[PDB]
Design a binder for this molecule. Structure first.
Ligand SMILES: CS(=O)(=O)N1CCC(O)CC1
Ligand SMILES: [Zn+2]
Ligand SMILES: [Zn+2]
Ligand SMILES: [Zn+2]
Length: 459
């Protein structure tokens, strides 16, 4: 049990308006054959064009919503819509392009998929709400065969060129005309009542319906993300390293220890309420403070209501000391808080578009995150950058230009001149901090927080 058997039954009711007379009894084997593809009894890594829900979840970075609408089918032009917002018109002779033959349309499809996916995944998974025309249009831009490698590198082949008779990955496919060995999943097979729009709109008010193929492609991928990452959550699935994952996670741990340690020194809170990950560890283990933990898993649907986290009867007095919400998404933070909140609007290879304004954050694990909302932070202010250190001024063991900065809160800077060690540590921390902010994380703190209160910790 690893791939989707070609002998699995495929429900054809969704296909019968575009394909009247379609047999009710149908397998993936017969559907693939009907789509114009011959699998030739091949044992070469590509057993089925269609994949399971579990395989699709493991390859969520490859998801591209795909829909085809009849503009007027060998006689009529087709509108091809992709969840990237692209609409192409193919003639058989929200970016909307005018009607062109398939030989040029297929060049555009390969360029669009390669640019969207080269930094995300080794493949493409066409996410469908299958009605017929999308499946029958695939022979015009898709080639299949044994699993292959790129002509210029070791990555698996995702494109084919008829001009050169060669294969390429998404990074080396310039000028390629066919999508090679794509994968696909029909959401309609999962068991839904009603059309695409009525199922999508139950969970999402951000994607409308301009009545074009890309709107359906977007709604389709959105509904699939809702089903696989919002109402169903699997934090055990591991995802490959495709970017700055390790550095971002290391920066997050450095910034957390820095900010919390300084808040405790500047305001001397007697108690800290750590609300979030049930597996959390004390980020400042040497601090004097009474550390109390409260379990809350990452919310994937809507942000937690502060009334449910704190009320309904713990120190009980969350108003005492300070509250630490490190990636714990709540509707409205209390005034006495230290907050790290992921901004879902951020553009990155780790952050994929999500459901209802939310985003799918994929860094080792997949975490659907509720929409970033500026009103959650009305009792707080933006945490300003600062570096604090009470370690001894000692080099030990990288060329130098003397550091001058009002935000290097150290004994050496208090005494007029930043030592080499604290300058090296300051620039390293500034790099980690910038990495974290640029990755989408935003930092917020109680209004009375003032770094001027840190200088008297040097007496
Ligand atoms: C995606 S998020 O909300 O920023 N968050 C951080 C990573 C994980 O440990 C919990 C969820
Ligand atoms: Zn390559
Ligand atoms: Zn949506
Ligand atoms: Zn120093």
């Amino acid at each position: 049990p690893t791939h989707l058997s070609v002998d699995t039954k495929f429900k054809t009711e969704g296909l019968c308006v575009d394909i009247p007379g379609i047999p009710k009894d149908m397998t993936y084997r017969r559907l693939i054959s009907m789509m114009g593809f011959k699998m030739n009894y091949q044992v070469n890594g590509y057993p089925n064009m269609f994949i399971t829900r579990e395989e699709a979840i493991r390859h969520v970075r490859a998801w591209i919503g795909f829909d085809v609408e009849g503009c007027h089918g060998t006689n009529l032009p087709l509108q091809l819509g992709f969840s990237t917002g692209v609409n192409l018109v193919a003639v058989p002779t929200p970016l909307m392009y005018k009607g062109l033959p398939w030989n040029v349309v297929r060049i555009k499809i390969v360029q669009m998929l390669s640019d969207t996916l080269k930094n995300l995944s080794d493949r493409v998974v066409f996410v469908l709400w299958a009605h017929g025309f999308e499946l029958t249009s695939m022979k015009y831009f898709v080639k299949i065969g044994p699993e292959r490698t790129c002509c210029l590198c070791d990555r698996r082949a995702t494109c084919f060129s008829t001009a050169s008779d060669t294969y390429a990955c998404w990074h080396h496919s310039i000028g390629f005309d066919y999508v090679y060995n794509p994968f696909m999943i029909d959401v309609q097979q999962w068991g839904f009542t009603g059309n695409l729009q009525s199922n999508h709109d139950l969970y999402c008010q951000v994607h409308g319906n301009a009545h074009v193929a890309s709107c359906d492609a977007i709604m389709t991928r959105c509904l699939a993300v809702h089903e696989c990452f919002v109402k169903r959550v699997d934090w055990t699935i591991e995802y490959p390293i495709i970017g700055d994952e390790l550095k971002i996670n290391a920066a997050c741990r450095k910034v957390q220890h820095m900010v919390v340690k300084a808040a405790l020194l500047a305001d001397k809170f007697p108690v800290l309420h750590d609300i979030g990950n049930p597996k959390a560890i004390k980020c400042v283990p040497q601090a004097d403070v009474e550390w109390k933990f409260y379990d809350a898993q990452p919310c994937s649907d809507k942000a937690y209501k502060i009334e449910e986290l704190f009320y309904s009867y713990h120190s009980d007095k969350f108003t005492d000391g300070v509250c630490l919400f490190w990636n714990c998404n709540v509707d409205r933070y209390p005034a006495n808080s230290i907050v790290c909140r992921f901004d879902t609007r951020v553009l990155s290879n780790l952050n994929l578009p999500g459901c209802d304004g939310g985003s799918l954050y994929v860094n080792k694990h997949a975490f659907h995150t509720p929409a970033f909302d500026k009103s959650a932070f009305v009792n707080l202010k933006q945490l300003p950058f600062f570096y604090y250190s009470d370690s001894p001024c000692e080099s030990h063991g990288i060329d130098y230009v003397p550091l001058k900065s009002a935000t290097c809160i150290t004994r050496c800077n208090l005494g007029g001149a930043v030592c080499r060690h604290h300058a090296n540590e300051y620039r390293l921390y500034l790099d980690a901090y910038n990495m974290m902010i640029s990755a989408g994380f935003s930092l917020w703190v109680y209004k009375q927080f003032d770094t001027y209160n840190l200088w008297n910790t040097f007496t």
